[PDB]
Each structure stands twice: as structure tokens, then as C-alpha cells.
Amino acid sequence: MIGLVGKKVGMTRIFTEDGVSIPVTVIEVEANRVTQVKDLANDGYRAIQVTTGAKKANRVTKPEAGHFAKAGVEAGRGLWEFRLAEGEEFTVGQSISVELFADVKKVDVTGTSKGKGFAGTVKRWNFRTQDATHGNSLSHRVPGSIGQNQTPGKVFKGKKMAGQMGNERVTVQSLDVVRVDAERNLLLVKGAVPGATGSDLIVKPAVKA
Amino acid sequence: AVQQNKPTRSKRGMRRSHDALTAVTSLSVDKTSGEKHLRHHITADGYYRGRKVIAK
Amino acid sequence: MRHRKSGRQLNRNSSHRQAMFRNMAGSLVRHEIIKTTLPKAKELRRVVEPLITLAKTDSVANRRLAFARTRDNEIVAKLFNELGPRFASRAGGYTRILKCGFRAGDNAPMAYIELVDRSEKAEAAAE
Amino acid sequence: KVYYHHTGHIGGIKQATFEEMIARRPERVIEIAVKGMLPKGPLGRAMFRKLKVYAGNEHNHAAQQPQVLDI
Amino acid sequence: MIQEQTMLNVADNSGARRVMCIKVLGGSHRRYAGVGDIIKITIKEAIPRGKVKKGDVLKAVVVRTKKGVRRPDGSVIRFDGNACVLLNNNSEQPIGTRIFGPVTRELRSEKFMKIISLAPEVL
Amino acid sequence: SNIIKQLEQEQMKQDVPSFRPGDTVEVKVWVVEGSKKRLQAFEGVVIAIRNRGLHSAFTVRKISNGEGVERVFQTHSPVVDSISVKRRGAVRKAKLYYLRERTGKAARIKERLN
RNA sequence: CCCGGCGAGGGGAGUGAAAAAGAACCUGAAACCGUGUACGUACAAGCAGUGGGAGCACGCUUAGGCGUGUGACUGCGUACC
RNA sequence: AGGACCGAACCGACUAAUGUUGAAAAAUUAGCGGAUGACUUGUGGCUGGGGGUGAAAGGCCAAUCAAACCGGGAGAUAGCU
RNA sequence: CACAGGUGGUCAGGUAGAGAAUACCAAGGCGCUUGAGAGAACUCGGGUGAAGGAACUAGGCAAAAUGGUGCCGUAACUUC
RNA sequence: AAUUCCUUGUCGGGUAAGUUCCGACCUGCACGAAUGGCGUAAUGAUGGCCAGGCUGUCUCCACCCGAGACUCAGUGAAAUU
RNA sequence: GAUGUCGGCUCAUCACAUCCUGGGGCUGAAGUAGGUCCCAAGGGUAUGGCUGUUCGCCAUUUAAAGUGGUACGCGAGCUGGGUUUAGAACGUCGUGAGACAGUUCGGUCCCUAUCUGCCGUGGGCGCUGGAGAACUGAGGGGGGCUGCUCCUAGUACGAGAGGACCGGAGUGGACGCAUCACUGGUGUUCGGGUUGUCAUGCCAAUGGCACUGCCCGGUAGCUAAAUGCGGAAGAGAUAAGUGCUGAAAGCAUCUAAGCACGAAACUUGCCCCGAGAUGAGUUCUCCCUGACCCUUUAAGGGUCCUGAAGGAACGUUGAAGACGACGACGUUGAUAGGCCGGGUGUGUAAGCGCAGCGAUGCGUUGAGCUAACCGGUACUAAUGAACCGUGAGGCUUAACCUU
């Protein structure tokens, strides 16, 4: 089963009857407007192409415009597609919204990664800050040696060094849905959504057992 | 640091290849005149969207 | 990085940023037209437009404030009496920055600054 | 035959089962068996680029009309 | 406590003046404590008619933190200093019969029916 | 959408008594406890501005006796029973921080008058 | 006489046997940096050399499988003191 | 009165941060001690290299000191590289 | 070297303050010449910290912290 | 012991603790009366130990400003080979 | 003609002869528990003191305090502290100079990254016309730990006390990732208070400057000391091991044929980058259907006419970031500043009236002033031209177009 492309829009410490407060993150649910709903009638391919959103989209290219023109006609924000399960999909006017979260207790959450600039040396990997004293040679902060000696004579792959994030996804996996609330369209999730505020996301129902 | 040997002159040229001065992709003229431009900035006659700039 | 921010600190400490902006704005109200760097030209726009806002109507406190941020006598006489009724009829955009080109002495990207209704201007040269 | 390699990560020698070579990329049992019979680096890449196996018994040189060969 | 060592104030009629934290309890590979943590104290002073004497090693609990304390609504009760009432070193509940200084409203449970219901101050 | 920072104003309650810094007040609350529902009070001086949308709270400092304690009671909390305004005292500051160590006759400010 | 700030530097016009003698001027290497041509560099690797060589320009190939220069590609292969 | 003191101006540099292909002849910035004295110190002068001069470090003796500088001996010598 | 180095004499205005400490300042000198921009790591300079209080390190340690005058009250040791 | 081959001696004390520090013992290193001894006030930019003031040195790190790095413009080195 | 040493941190990496969970035999093992005991690199694996220092001693955490290598990891990182210690001096020895693997006092490492690796990023080319959009998985890593008690279960078994695992479960601890509402932190782009001189002609008032002058509060952002939280059901191939059916050896036997079962490792499942996968992918969405001169012509060269879809420079600039790229987007425009409604800050704006012995306070004013965030407003600045991109785009078998 597919995901809902949300928007990160709100964070609230909300009260409950029992004198306990819950920090929560608030995702505004939009309905999926289908493009073509591609299926495995044609090739070995199986995924459903969805636009949950819109833009003024006065500067877009014709290959992007005819794509919204055959869809739900909403000058779309962009093109997201999703792998699917449990048989082929109902292909027109389908309008997947708050109902997806009606039986889902826990969600995966697939982010747009985290948009923290440079992130990079020392900070991103939470390393120690070298001594700020003792006349340490042109050095008040350093990450630490990335190899060993001539015997391997190299730096091994996968070491935590430097760089920007590259803004991939980052999935927390299996964090709780507190509630879903229809007609107001609020999905309260208990954990955080990746990125700064105002970001886009995918919140997709959990994969994991 | 230092270096091992004095390096070959093909190396010195590969090393500069991305740092070379890059093409301007042609030039601008005004949409509404035969006065020459400076692209998406204002000329010596104030010309872009009229008024006046740069009375030197 | 700089996420979910705006505006600018340019080249120095608060006192210098204040003193420079006083110099440059004090010069604006008397000369009508100036040239500076594009980040700097924006901070100038953002300094002068709130001084005009106080000045639309006479009001002794709004005259005191205008004398407090730029403590020069040439601007507070120009404000309110001359310059108050002029910009009275707009609600923001009393001035525009015109992106004039690069700086001759080095290259720092530059804008000419020019009042919204400015059409009378010296034709004398600048360096 | 567990195909020992050390691409760049994590403690241990690494491996892949004999079952991987048939369940996934099903050619691969014959491929990295004829691979080791070709010379050093570059020439052995130039020899190689003529072999194909596919997933098996779904082959796509129908139009060329292939010469059959018995071993 | 929050650093290794850390001297804090005595909060019961068991001893006198100040006492030194030797370890944090309620985990390991810890450098820092949460608010709801159980502390390990040594007594560096004591009082001749208290429950204890100098250099006896005990278990204890926080009654004030200068940083402040929280749990149910996440709102803090923030205090003027760190302070600790000693527990029994194996059989639980406080050792002292009196509290000295303020208290939290998070200690209001079956296992403290002795120590938050006292009259002397901050009831 | 338009919801960002707007959801703090939407949640914010309106049946809330008016306030100025140094206002004394009393928070009555429950103890909750193991088998019995009983109530209890705290009075003193409010040392800080409130208004935090939903997160708005009375930050009372008691500072009457003993060593200083600040208590934060959240206005929207279901276990908060009743709120009297009482006396309206002056400070000419947003905050009262200089009175932290003094507990003797510091939480008893006067009505401010004209 | 042309260009440029009154500049620096060069060219044209004109001088001489000669400026491929232009004022630091004698003819003039090599290092030195750059142009122009040929042909090369994106299934692509190590003393860059040796052996085999598609291809391509020029040489009436005297066409008699060659000469010249370059050279995809690749067997083999560890500088001098 | 004072081989006294806190302390500029005036002089030094115990320690600390920095510098270390520095601005630097350890300077800078901060803690610090001499300055009512065996202190700080301008001018003119003098002793010449295992020799001077030393409240002592085998200190300092023309941007330099457990061996100054130059001119001759001098192509020292080398059993050695 | 227009070296953040070294270097004798003379004259002596203001508020607070013990004064020629030290923030500013009257007459006066004078901008120790790259600039503007980025709100990147980081390097150097400069600023701040919950709670702790050197626990960092061979080592408190420059940032930060002491500092002035009026007055009470004043220890073990002392050649006072 | 600013002294101990063994040894980080023994015991008490400080102490979250104690190879250091301080006191007592001799089972005494090679202690021991002018490279002087016992003992002492004053004085030091003078050593170790302790708790308290205080502090981003640190636990444990976050953020701001500026010159470099970096961006744009100018000029344009060096260890090395 | 320099292969240069000790211990610790930061940062590591590789071998398993495994500290521990886990699966299994034996037992002088009833069960439990322990003694004995094999498979297993997957994962977690504590802190302060004194000493130059690993080891020590002592106080201490947890279920726990591992094994081995790495110029005996890591001075073109750190302490360079010890080790050489030149000076001094203790202790010691000799006529003496000077010494000590006895000792006490402070006191110096320098290298801007050329080739190479690593991580992050762009440029050039190619997937067969071009362009733009989603995307599959050949490939290769991330996560993988582990206490607690409830149930399971007071039951088999044992004289009696007692008495376990798998599975469901909540929850702690370590580890990993995001995050900024909560709680702190900072916030030289916001407010206020205040010392001094200098200043606004002068005062009441107010302002340049003094490290952001000093001092107290501070939005949004960012951030751990605060916040949420996975660590998985299931599958195969098995290991040690219990066998059945059965031979070598008429039988017996875990084995050899044969078949049920048997661990977190391993193939995975859960997570992520990924078609340069040249064996170059599918699928979606847009657009271009003119001509001659010449030569080696699946073609290339040259030219008139003529170039769409799209791109880039350029531009303001961002919820994206070194630069780029990515992204909003250039009057079709909320991009950014002003400006208006709203979030959230501060502490009562100059003047005036009034009271007072004046400083000063109080009514006008719950004032005024106000930053990043959110929505509006075209008020304002982004000529919005030209240009690079072209006229439907290979051979050959098979299948198709009268073929």
C-alpha cells in the first residue's frame, strides 16, 4: 500500500483528559488527484502516479503541463509515484485522504531529509571539540584521524567525514500515530517529521512488523 | 605540504580546466530600442525601464 | 545554512552598521539619489521607509523618534513639512532600488537608489 | 563457492550464498565462473562483452536465427 | 549527578550542611542525569542524633534541582538549588522523617506517603 | 497553507482572566493521588508574562518563607480547579527576578491605584 | 600615419646590403610559454619502452603490400648513478 | 630616613591565551614584579678572543657566542668519505 | 621593510576617581591602506551560557572572576 | 623526608579518591650538625594538598559578530623538484 | 644522505581462539541452578583519583566490566608530560672534572594538500532525433544489542524447600536517527534601563561613542542539557545436535542414498543511494513532417531559408546550500523590501495637564514601539529581447505495411 504526500505545518503540546500532555506534530492531509494510474497491463511495471497538491505553476514546461492536463486538473505542485499491494487500484476519482490512517496505529514516515546547510565536520557526527588551550598547533577543533598507517595505506569507505546531507529521505520507521481527525483533516503524529517547518513530506503507513 | 617530483605540463593544464573563464552566451539589446545594453542592469542613459540612472 | 531567516548584518559591528546607515541616510534626504552595494542598498531602503511612515502626519512624538534614529536637523525639517504630505498617499514603497551594475573600484554588485516619484535629478557626474 | 569480496565496509570477510547466485541474477553462476578464465584487466573486458545468458529460456535473438551448438 | 563528583545540599534531619554525590543511579554509561533520576550519596558531615554518620554510603532521590524538574504536563517546578533526601540503601522510602526546603508535586505517590505530606514548609 | 503560527491563535482560550506582571493570584489544583480525590492551593506572586497560545501558564513564585520555589501551572490543564485574580501589583518590568532570594514579605504587593 | 590618458608597447609609411641589423639592435641553441596542422584521448589503467597493428594525411608507392608521420587497440615487460 | 610597599608615566617579562612558511631580534593581549632605589639612565671614555668583563649562566663581547672578525700561513691534514 | 620591536630632555586643560590608573574628552595628532560579500566548516580575534565547578590536562587558565572609598567587626602566628 | 636499593613501605587524615601531599614508626637507604643541623616571623611573579568564590578548559555542546578560508575584484609568493 | 620511542583522548579499523542474548550435547544433570560444553563477527561492551603511564591501589556503575593486531593504530591531530633534561639542587660517589634507568622545580615540535585515498559537490561525454517528468532493481551498505518483572508456569519433576523456555506484554539501559512544541541555551537584524563625556543654539527631553559601552528581558531560527523512537512478524539454506528409515559391517548406527526438525550469523524480510546494467531499461508527458552544391557517402562537408519542445546565461531571491546544483520565480509575478491583519516580545513613547519641598510620580497611554514566521497588498524592482537547440532522425535477419 501507498503513502500520502503531506505538509509539515504545525507543532503542538496538546492536553488530554488525564492531566497528561502529548507533544505532537500536525500534518495537513490533502486528497490524491490521479494522473493515469499506471499498472502491469503494460510491462513489468507496477506503481500509481499521484499529485496531492497545486502551484500557481505559471513557469512550468509543457511535459509537466500536459501531465496535469490528463490528471485531476490542479496545475500541480509536482509528480510523486508509489508502489502498491493487494491487487490493482480503482483508477479514477480515487481521492485517498484521512481514511488511509483510520486503521493505521504506527507509520514509517519517509522524509525529504533535513536541510541543515553544511552539517559537515565535527557537528553532523557529534564528535568531541579538541582542547581550546595548550597551544595545540593551529587547532581549537578537529574531527580525528580517518585511517591508520602504511599496512592498509588508505582511508576505508563509510567513514563519518565532512559534506552536506544530499537531502535523500531519512525514515525513522514505526513511530505512533496518536490520532486521525477527519473533516478538519489533521493527522496528529507523535514523533517529528524531517526538515525545517513549512517542508513537504511523505507520511506513508508502516512497512514493518 | 611539498611535492614528490616536478609535475608534467599536461597536469598543470587539466588542473586549470574548470577554473577557466566561461562564455557569456551572447548579449542583450533593449526590447524597445536600438540602444545597447548591459544585461538586466541599467545603461549609461538610464535605459532598462526608462527613468534615469548613472549620470557620469 | 541560514534557514527560515531574513535580512543582513553586512561588514561590521552594530555601532558601525548604525553609524554608516546614519551617514548614508543623512546623505539620502539631501541628495535625492545615491549608489551602493545591493545587500547595503536594501538595508538603506529598509531604514528610510519607516522614517517616512512616522512623517505622514504631524505628531510631536513621531517627530521626536525621527530625530532619535537619525539625529540630524536637515532630515527632520525635510521630513513632515516637505516630505510628509508627499508620501502620505502610499502605504509602503515610498522608494525603489534600481540595479545599476557592478562597482568600478572592484566589482561588488551595486544598485542606484531612487525615490518613487523622483524625476527631477542632477545630470552632474559621479565616481 | 561463497564468492569472497570486501567492497569497503564492516568487520568480517564478506560472502554470498550459492543459492543467491541461482535465485537472483540467475546467469551469475556461469558468469563469474567463465570470468576467471579471461586475461588480467582490460583484454578480459574486451573478450567478455560478447557473452550473454539472460534469466533463462526467454532469449531475444530470435530474429538473428542463432546457430545451434552441441557440447 | 550532572558531572562526576558534585556536592549538594542536605534535605533531611539525618545529617548536616552538605553532602557529595558519588554516582548517578538508574542506569550506566551515563554522564548526565534526567530530572526523575535516583542519585548515590556519601555523607561528608552528619549530625550526632540523625539517622546516619560521616562516610556511610547510601542511595537517595532528588527533591530539588536548580535546573528544574518535570514530567506530567512537561511544566517545571524550578528551584533555588540542588537538594537530596537519602533513601534506605536496599529497602526504599526516605530515611529521614523531616524534609528541609521546598518539594516537588511529582513525588505524590504510594511510595512517598511519608515525605510530601509533612507540615514544615511548601505543602 | 495559512495554518503555520495560526494554530497557536486557534487553540488559544478566551475565557481567561486579564493580567499585568506582579499580579498575585491563586492556583487551586488537585493532588490526584492513590484512591482519594482531594484539592490544594498555591498563592504568591507571578514573576512572568504568560500568553503562549495553547502552552499559556501561570508562572507563580511563592517566595514567602523558606528558600525560593517557582511553580508553573498550565492554564489548559484539566486538573486546574479555580483561578482568582486578587491583588494587582506593580513592578514596571516584565519580570520580577531580583526578588528570588528574598522570601520575607516579597509576595504581598499592593493594589496599584490611580 | 593608426591605436591609448598627456601613457606603455607594437604596426603601417619611409630608411639600409641587411631591421629574419629597429636602438637591451652581432648569427643563435636548450630550458621557457604559446599558436597552427595532422592524427589521438568518454568499455576507459602501472618506468610510458619494446613487439604486433585497424585507421588516417602526404610520397605519380614505379600498386607490388612499401616510405614518412601519427595511431584506436593489445601480447611482453621492474629507471640510471 | 628607608637596599619597604599598591602603582602609572618609565623599565622588565614569573605565568597564561595566541603566534610558530609571525608584523616580531617572544612580540602581542591579560594576569604580574622593580619605579622615595643595589631603580630607571642621557652624554663622553676604556680593557681585544681560552683575552677581556661577570651579585655565576662555562653569561656577554658590531642584528651572533661552552670558542668574535678579517688578512697571511693554506692547496693544514685525512690514516677517511 | 612606511617592521604591532628599541629609544634621552622639556611643557602641562576637563567629569568620576587616590593620580600622569583607567571609559570618554578640550587644543591637536590621526584612519597603522586590500575591499565588499557570505550569517559555510574551520583558523585567528571578539561575545555568551542551564546544571555542575577543573570533574579538561603534565598543569586553573589568557575569555570570565578579585580590585575603589566611607564605616562596623576582626583569627591562629609576629622580630609588631 | 623536595633524601628510602626494596617501595606506589606501614598506619591515620584529607578524600567519591590518593604512586603525590602531610603526620607518626623503625622492620633506620647510604639521614646527621658550616655543599651545615633543630626552629621562626617577615618576604617571593616560588612548589604540593584541600574546600569554598568564580569561570565553555570540560562533562556536552549550541548560537552570534568580524578578519582570513570561502564568494566577487586586484596583485601574486613558498617549502619543494 | 633518518623506516622516529612510551601511556591516554578524539577519531578509528580489521582477526574470533565470544564479555553477553541466542540454538544444542553430556553430567557424578530429577527440575532449577551449576560443573562440563560445541556453533556463532551480528550488536551493545562504564567513571573519578593519585602516577609521565598502560598495569596498580581505592571509591564507584551495570546484567556486564571482553580476547588480538595495526611505523606495538592515530606528533604533514592533540598533551609532548616522561624518556635525553643542557641549568639548579636533594640523595650518592671520587683529590677532581662528572655521573646515576634513585630524586625534586619550571621550560619550545615545524610543514598553506602537487599525485594518492576518503566524504561531499560540480564540469565533459554517452544510452541512437531531441526534450522534460516519474521510476524498476542488476548492485552495495544501514538497523541488528541487552536488563527488568507480569503472564507463560507453582506445572512436569522432587523427600522437601524449590521449579524453566518459547510466545504475548509493558518498560529501563546502551546504540542510531530525526525534531524545536515542551524545557533550557543563544539570538551585534526587537524592546527597555543606565554610568560618563561629547552633542542637538540652551534646558525640560534626546542622541554619537565607550568590547554588541555596560546591564536586564527577547522573536523566528538553530540546538541538547530537552523532545519522539526503531531495534520486526515471517521465509530459506543450515551449524553443533535429536532422529526416523538404512548401508559400508545380514545388524547396529545423526548419513552414505532417503525424509521431519534444528541460532540473532549467512540468503533475506525492515531502511537507503542506484541503468555507464555498453547486455545502457521500462513507462509517461511535449515538439520539430524545407531545399541545393560536393566528396570517403548506414555518412560527412558546405549554404540559403530557418530552428519547435526545451535549455543556459542573466535576475530578484528561497522553508535548498561553500561554489554550484536543487527550488520559488522576472509583471502570467507574494521572489524580496516597504506596508496592512495575525503569531510571539517589551514595560508605559516626546509633548501636555496635575500633584509635590524637588528628584520624581500619576491621568492622557494596558501606552508606544516590534526581527527572521504566516497570509494579504503589484506600492516597488526584476526590457523579460537575443542566443544554443532545427525541418520526423542507421544497418541487417525475422514479423508487418499490395512487401
Tab-separated table of C-alpha atoms in Angstrom, chain C:
chain	number	residue	atom	x	y	z
C	1	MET	CA	22.777	27.152	6.315
C	2	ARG	CA	20.665	30.221	7.264
C	3	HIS	CA	17.119	28.644	7.220
C	4	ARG	CA	13.808	30.374	7.999
C	5	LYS	CA	15.747	33.729	8.313
C	6	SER	CA	15.914	37.126	6.532
C	7	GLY	CA	17.891	40.449	6.488
C	8	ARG	CA	21.532	41.455	6.889
C	9	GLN	CA	24.487	42.341	9.080
C	10	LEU	CA	26.974	43.306	6.089
C	11	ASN	CA	30.595	44.210	7.048
C	12	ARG	CA	30.824	45.161	10.814
C	13	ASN	CA	29.671	45.674	14.464
C	14	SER	CA	26.301	47.227	15.435
C	15	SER	CA	27.730	50.705	16.112
C	16	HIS	CA	29.381	50.826	12.669
C	17	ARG	CA	26.241	49.471	10.890
C	18	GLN	CA	24.199	52.103	12.774
C	19	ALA	CA	26.801	54.992	12.050
C	20	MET	CA	27.206	54.095	8.364
C	21	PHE	CA	23.433	53.848	7.900
C	22	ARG	CA	23.140	57.350	9.614
C	23	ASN	CA	25.813	58.739	7.261
C	24	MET	CA	24.188	57.176	4.131
C	25	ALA	CA	20.560	58.140	5.090
C	26	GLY	CA	21.631	61.573	6.227
C	27	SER	CA	23.133	61.979	2.689
C	28	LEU	CA	19.926	60.491	1.089
C	29	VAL	CA	17.445	63.044	2.285
C	30	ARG	CA	19.715	65.986	0.899
C	31	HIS	CA	20.988	64.426	-2.395
C	32	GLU	CA	17.861	62.601	-3.573
C	33	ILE	CA	19.904	59.880	-5.452
C	34	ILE	CA	22.765	57.556	-4.236
C	35	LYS	CA	24.574	54.485	-5.312
C	36	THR	CA	25.699	51.494	-3.019
C	37	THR	CA	26.111	47.643	-2.946
C	38	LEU	CA	22.981	45.556	-3.413
C	39	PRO	CA	22.822	43.999	0.167
C	40	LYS	CA	23.600	47.572	1.511
C	41	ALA	CA	21.037	49.308	-0.711
C	42	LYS	CA	18.359	47.006	0.761
C	43	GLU	CA	19.272	47.870	4.316
C	44	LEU	CA	19.044	51.602	3.278
C	45	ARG	CA	15.582	51.073	1.728
C	46	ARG	CA	14.503	49.308	4.988
C	47	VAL	CA	15.923	52.219	7.266
C	48	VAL	CA	14.314	55.142	5.376
C	49	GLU	CA	10.772	53.890	4.539
C	50	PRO	CA	9.758	53.701	8.445
C	51	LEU	CA	11.054	57.274	8.929
C	52	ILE	CA	8.693	58.365	6.077
C	53	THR	CA	5.921	56.311	7.865
C	54	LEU	CA	6.198	58.411	11.094
C	55	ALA	CA	6.283	61.537	8.918
C	56	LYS	CA	2.927	61.267	7.007
C	57	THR	CA	1.056	63.286	9.686
C	58	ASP	CA	2.380	65.787	12.106
C	59	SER	CA	2.788	64.341	15.603
C	60	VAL	CA	5.451	65.603	18.129
C	61	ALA	CA	6.472	62.033	19.291
C	62	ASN	CA	6.792	60.781	15.747
C	63	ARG	CA	8.947	63.872	15.176
C	64	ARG	CA	10.965	63.073	18.343
C	65	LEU	CA	11.503	59.357	17.089
C	66	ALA	CA	12.600	60.576	13.682
C	67	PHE	CA	15.173	62.895	15.481
C	68	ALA	CA	16.286	59.889	17.662
C	69	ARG	CA	17.086	57.209	14.971
C	70	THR	CA	18.795	59.958	12.658
C	71	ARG	CA	19.827	62.855	14.910
C	72	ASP	CA	20.434	65.417	12.182
C	73	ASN	CA	18.380	68.690	11.779
C	74	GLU	CA	18.367	68.650	7.886
C	75	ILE	CA	16.293	65.396	7.743
C	76	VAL	CA	13.680	66.391	10.461
C	77	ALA	CA	12.891	69.675	8.705
C	78	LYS	CA	12.632	67.817	5.402
C	79	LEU	CA	10.506	65.155	6.964
C	80	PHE	CA	6.915	66.129	7.936
C	81	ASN	CA	6.846	69.635	6.335
C	82	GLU	CA	8.122	68.875	2.882
C	83	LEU	CA	8.337	65.196	2.700
C	84	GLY	CA	5.312	64.125	4.951
C	85	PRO	CA	2.423	65.152	2.689
C	86	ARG	CA	4.327	63.862	-0.454
C	87	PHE	CA	4.377	60.137	0.507
C	88	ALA	CA	1.111	60.382	2.547
C	89	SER	CA	-0.910	58.732	-0.138
C	90	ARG	CA	1.065	55.418	-0.388
C	91	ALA	CA	1.220	52.670	2.105
C	92	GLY	CA	4.735	51.277	1.566
C	93	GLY	CA	7.037	51.606	-1.446
C	94	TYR	CA	7.976	55.210	-0.968
C	95	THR	CA	11.338	54.347	-2.730
C	96	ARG	CA	12.735	51.832	-5.321
C	97	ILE	CA	16.275	50.425	-5.821
C	98	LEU	CA	17.380	50.221	-9.417
C	99	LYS	CA	20.067	47.532	-10.062
C	100	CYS	CA	22.625	49.686	-11.757
C	101	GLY	CA	25.625	47.282	-12.301
C	102	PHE	CA	28.989	46.386	-10.748
C	103	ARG	CA	31.326	48.625	-8.861
C	104	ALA	CA	34.097	50.161	-10.843
C	105	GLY	CA	36.771	50.217	-7.992
C	106	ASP	CA	36.468	46.419	-7.562
C	107	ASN	CA	33.305	44.539	-8.570
C	108	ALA	CA	30.828	44.499	-5.565
C	109	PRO	CA	27.343	44.235	-7.134
C	110	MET	CA	25.713	47.740	-6.952
C	111	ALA	CA	22.233	49.470	-7.093
C	112	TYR	CA	21.360	53.066	-7.608
C	113	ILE	CA	18.606	54.224	-5.082
C	114	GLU	CA	15.917	56.380	-6.306
C	115	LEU	CA	12.701	57.808	-4.731
C	116	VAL	CA	9.362	56.517	-6.116
C	117	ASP	CA	8.260	59.838	-7.746
C	118	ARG	CA	11.885	61.182	-8.489
C	119	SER	CA	12.087	62.735	-11.992
C	120	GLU	CA	13.984	65.897	-11.104
C	121	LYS	CA	17.757	64.866	-10.697
C	122	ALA	CA	21.218	66.321	-11.123
C	123	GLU	CA	22.842	65.448	-14.520
C	124	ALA	CA	26.340	66.224	-12.951
C	125	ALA	CA	28.868	63.327	-12.888
C	126	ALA	CA	29.650	60.669	-10.157
C	127	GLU	CA	32.720	58.484	-9.382
